[PDB]
Structures are given as C-alpha cells and as structure tokens.
Design a protein around this ligand. Structure first.
Ligand code: GTP
Ligand code: MYR
Ligand code: MG
Lengths: 319, 267
C-alpha cells in the first residue's frame, strides 16, 4: 500500500505529500482544518500484536508534554483508522534541523547556539515531565521559521536496548533516513527496559555536534559500536566544531559512561553565559515563548506585539 | 417639505481622485509695524508688512502623515491684493484620497516677501483631513493661524487650526439650518455674538484662514468620504482550535525569499 492510499479512507485529513516510506512507518504530509500535519502510518501486518500498550504510552506522553514548549508529542493516535493501519498525528513544522542546516539563510553561530540551547531546553522539559525521547536526531529536531525548536517523534514505541550482534533492530526502528547515523547511547547496546535520561543526553549531544559540524554525523553504527568498545573516539568530527565551548559540551554529553552525563538542566547551568548567552535565559526563551505553544497570536498581531515591544526588546538584547 | 435622511458615503480608498483644498480669505490683522525692529534690521522695511496694507501673500498647502510630508507643497497662484486677502483658489493637492492615512493633515503656511529671494512665514495652520470619526472634512472651515511660524506637520501638530470658537460653530450650524430658527431670539442673540466677536478682534491679533473642501456629488446626492482601507471588511477567519497544530507558523507554506534572492544572484 502506498502512503497516499491510506488517506483515501480518511475524510478529515487530505493527503498532501510523502515525507518518506520505511518499513517501520510510512510518513505523509496531510492538510487539515488546522494546518498541515504529519501522519505516521503503521501498517499493522500482524493483528496479534497489542497496540494498546503503545496507545497508552502515547496518551501519557501527550499529557506530560502538553506544557513542554519545545516538545511536540504525537497529538493523536488511531489503532484502526484504516483497519490494517495505525496512525500518529502531529503538526508539521517548517523545517527539520537536518534540512534547516542546509536551507538558507544559513544558521549563524548565535542561531546554532539558540538551537542547541533549545534542544537542551526541550530535553530538560521532557525529562522534568517524566518523558524520555528515545531517539533524538537532527531529523527529529524541528525548527519553526522563527527558529523555535520542537523536539518531535518521541521514540516510545522503539526499543530501549538493541543487540550489538544483530543490526536488524537498528535498521528497522532507528536510522529511517538511511544515513547509517547512530546517536543511540552506547549502553543501549547489549547482547523491554526503561529509557534513561542519560540515553537522551548522548543523543542530544550528538545532535548538537552535527548541528555545529554543518551536518557531519558524529557517529554511524560501526563508529558508535567502536566507541562502545573504546576503539574509536570521534576526534576528527569534534574538531569540525568551530566553537571550543560547544565542543566541550558535546564531548561532555557524548561521554561513554552514562554516569558522567549530567542532566539537561546541569548542562544549561554550566553553559549559562559561556555556551549559551545570558540573554537566552533572561529574555529570549521567555519572550519567544509567547509565540510558542497553544498560542493564538496572528501574523498581523505578532508584528504588532513586536512593534509595541521594540523598545523593551532592544534594551534587553542590546542595552 | 424635505428630502430624505439617507447618509451617503464613499470609502476614502475607493475615491481615486486628487484632494482639492480651496484657499479662501485670510481674515485678521498682521503684527502691525514694529518700527523698533526696523531700526535694528533695515531689511525689514523692504518687506510686505511695511510696503503695503495687504501684501500679495501666498499660501503653501502640504499634506503630512505621521509627521512626514506625503508630497511636495502646493502654492497658491499669484493674486494681487489691495484691501483684503482673498485667494478664492482651489488647490489640487498631489495626494489622492486612497493615499491619505487616518492622521493626514494639511499644513497651510501664509508667506510674505522679506527682501529679495526670501519668504517669511506670516503664519501657519494645520487641520486634520479626517474628522473625529474618520470622515473627510466637508465645506467651509475657518482655521486659527499661528503668527510668524510655518504650519507644523508633526503629529501632534503645534499649530492646530481647530468663546468665538464655540459660537462660530453654532453660527455655522444656524446658517446651514441645523439649529432651529427663532426670529425674535436670533435677532437678539446674534447682536451679542457680534459684540463678542468685536471684543475678540480688539483683544487679540488672531487671523483665520478660511478654507473649503470639495463636495462629492452624484445624482444630486451628497457623499461623505469616510476613511477606509481596502479589505477593511475582511474579518479574519480566526479559529481557536489547537487539536493537532499547537504551534502555528505564519511562514508555513511560503516561498523562501532568502533562497530566491540567492538563486537570482548565483544562477
Ligand atoms: N520540515 C519538516 N520535515 C519533517 C517533518 N516531519 C518529518 N519530516 C521530514 O521527513 C523525514 C521523514 O520523517 P520521519 O519518519 O519523522 O523521519 P525521522 O526523523 O528519521 O523519523 P524517526 O526515525 O521516527 O525519528 C524526517 O527526517 C524529516 O526530515 C516536519 O514536521 N517538518
Ligand atoms: C494506536 C497506537 C498506535 C501506535 C503506533 C506505533 C506502533 C509501533 C509497533 C512496533 C512493532 C514492531 C514489530 C516488529 O518488531 O516487527
Ligand atoms: Mg520521525
């Protein structure tokens, strides 16, 4: 079944585009009353499998991440929408960071810093809420056209632990871009656990690496398996990071032993001022949050909010 | 008995014609002839104040919005004055009704000769083009003239053209027929207004520039020009749903203009 075929049975969501077919999900862009939406359609080949376990999880991710301004959970889920398919619904964002890195205008250092700041803010938001994103990747970091980061596609249905012996489990659930990139924390490799906050910190650290290397992946599956065994360290790619302090944050976060990986809030404490401008904590995160989530401010009213606040904005950012 | 009460109007953004302003008469006296100042400045005897009772003054009309001029000033054509300043000239302004924002004003400056190649402002006056509820001013208006200054086009203007102030309005309303007529009472009351007016003539050296605005007529109807913007009826289809799309993006399905600028410069 083609990705579009599934939408023939649905009235409320009109097919728009395909984002990419993989044996795990077929992803389409759909037009909706509210805007554009990503529909991850899961062809449920074996009806014996209980999707009720995944539907519960996603409904508690949806509740916990309701107020997480930089997290975008799946907002809907439908076990039988096409009888042989399930579907996960979330808004569609302007960019995904992997593409944004290449689209113009190119991200400045200060914009990359703002994206890495908000990646750590998103991880911190979900982690405080009680949620883990079991695969952060640049594809899953989403960027509004005002550079609000939304972390999306929370990997609650993906396995926390993978065997190193059989790459079949990685190939199915992870690396749907088919880039062979591997940000799966090394201790997630063995030979239905719970996901750990340090398993996101390795994933997030590698995404900040790739962000600051202009898309050079820090590891692929063999390199992560070597790093897991201590036979490789990505010094070459880390030296493509142009900023020493983001380089050390990444080198901290990708640390091999999870015990040495702090909380996202700690990296944001340590990085105050030095990696992340003070103004990110004091003005831009709280000011920009008024545009962010379940907010209702029109393009016409956005410009009037920013015009009416120009003087205040100039003082905070500039002085 | 009377034509109906229907109020006809045109949107300002639909009336694509030049604004025209009649410069009527300049009533009032000038600043006498201070011969103290002439001893200090001998060039001052060679100025319209000191050469004729009515120098051949001219007015410049310029439209301002947000403190900026919308176009160049328009000058009254030369008219030789002997005993009264009465241009009686319709000036076609370089601005059209669609071009006028809600805070458009006309800054009117009366100019006089001050020696060779030098005009001095006799006075200035500024009046907003739309009224209190956004209707273009209609008919004959008498504007307070501020002595020895140019009309100020800044927002708010320092030379607004708008006892005798209140009475004149009532008098205009009476002459138009909006006030009820009571002959025995009008006869008595207007003598008092005349006394008030004469007292103000002697008390103050005020000048008034009477101007007029054109009347828009079609089939013997009167249309007021109300300020509007095209699409002003487009009440945005705002809806309060956030079931899936929690974070609206205004640039969502829009051409990337920074990539097209780049395409146009590389390719
Ligand atoms: N701009 C934009 N691109 C998206 C969006 N959703 C998905 N895509 C793109 O389409 C690709 C395919 O969709 P996904 O299945 O989510 O790809 P992915 O991030 O590798 O997916 P997972 O492996 O499940 O995390 C993504 O990598 C993105 O590049 C979106 O909301 N906005
Ligand atoms: C109604 C809830 C819909 C949930 C959608 C995600 C379900 C993912 C199931 C993954 C099954 C893996 C099967 C396999 O290992 O071959
Ligand atoms: Mg995804």
């Amino acid at each position: 079944l083609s990705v579009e075929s599934y939408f023939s049975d649905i009235h409320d969501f009109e097919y728009d585009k395909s984002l990419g077919s993989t044996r795990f999900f077929k992803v389409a862009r759909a037009k909706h009353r509210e805007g554009l939406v990503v529909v991850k359609v899961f062809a449920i080949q074996d009806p014996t499998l209980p999707l009720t376990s995944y539907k519960q999880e996603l409904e508690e991710l949806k509740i916990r991440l309701n107020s997480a301004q930089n997290c975008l959970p799946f907002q809907k889920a439908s076990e039988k929408a096409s009888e042989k398919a399930a579907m996960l619904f979330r808004q569609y964002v302007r960019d995904n960071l992997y593409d944004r890195i290449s689209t113009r205008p190119f991200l400045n250092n200060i914009e990359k810093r703002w994206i890495a700041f908000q990646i750590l803010t998103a991880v911190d938001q979900a982690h405080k809420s009680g949620v883990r994103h079991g695969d952060i990747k640049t594809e899953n970091v989403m960027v509004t056209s005002w550079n609000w980061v939304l972390l999306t596609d929370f990997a609650s249905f993906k396995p926390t632990y993978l065997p190193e012996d059989n790459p079949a489990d990685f190939n199915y659930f992870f690396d749907t871009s088919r880039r062979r990139t591997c940000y799966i924390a090394p201790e997630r490799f063995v030979d239905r656990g719970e996901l750990k906050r340090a398993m996101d910190i390795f994933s997030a650290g590698c995404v900040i690496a790739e962000l600051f290397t202009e898309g050079v992946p820090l590891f692929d599956l063999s390199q992560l398996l070597a790093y897991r065994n201590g036979h490789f360290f990505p010094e070459q790619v880390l030296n493509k990071i142009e900023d020493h302090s983001i380089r050390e944050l990444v080198t901290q976060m990708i640390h091999r032993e999870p015990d040495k990986r702090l909380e996202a809030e700690d990296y944001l404490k340590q990085q105050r001022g030095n990696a992340f401008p003070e103004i990110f904590y004091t003005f831009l995160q709280p000011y920009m949050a008024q545009f962010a989530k379940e907010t209702f401010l029109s393009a016409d009213e956005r410009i009037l909010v920013i015009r009416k606040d120009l003087g205040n904005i100039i003082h905070n950012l500039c002085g | 008995m009377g034509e109906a009460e229907k109020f006809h109007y045109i949107y300002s953004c639909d009336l694509d014609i030049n604004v025209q302003l009649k410069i009527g008469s300049l009533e009032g006296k000038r600043e006498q002839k201070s011969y103290k100042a002439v001893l200090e400045d001998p060039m001052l005897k060679f100025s319209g104040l000191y050469q004729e009772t009515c120098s051949d003054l001219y007015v410049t009309c310029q439209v301002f919005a947000e403190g900026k001029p919308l176009a160049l000033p328009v000058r009254t054509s030369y008219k030789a004055f002997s005993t009264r300043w009465n241009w009686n000239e319709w000036l076609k302004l370089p601005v059209k009704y669609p071009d006028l924002p809600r805070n458009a004003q006309v800054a009117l400056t009366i100019w006089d000769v001050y020696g060779p190649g030098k005009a001095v402002p006799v006075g200035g006056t500024t009046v907003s083009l739309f009224g209190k509820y956004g209707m273009f001013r209609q008919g004959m208006h008498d504007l307070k003239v501020w002595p020895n200054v140019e009309a100020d086009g800044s927002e708010p203007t320092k030379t607004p053209g708008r006892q005798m102030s209140r009475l004149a309005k009532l008098t205009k309303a009476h002459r138009q027929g909006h006030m009820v007529k009571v002959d025995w009472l009008d006869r008595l009351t207007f003598r008092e207004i005349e006394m008030i007016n004469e007292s103000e003539k002697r008390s103050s050296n005020f000048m008034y520039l009477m101007v007029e605005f054109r009347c828009v007529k079609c089939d013997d109807k009167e249309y007021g020009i109300v300020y509007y913007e095209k699409d002003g009826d487009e009440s945005s289809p705002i809806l309060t749903s956030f079931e899936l799309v929690k974070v609206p993006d205004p640039q969502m399905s829009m051409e990337n203009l920074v990539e097209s600028k780049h395409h146009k410069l590389a390719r």
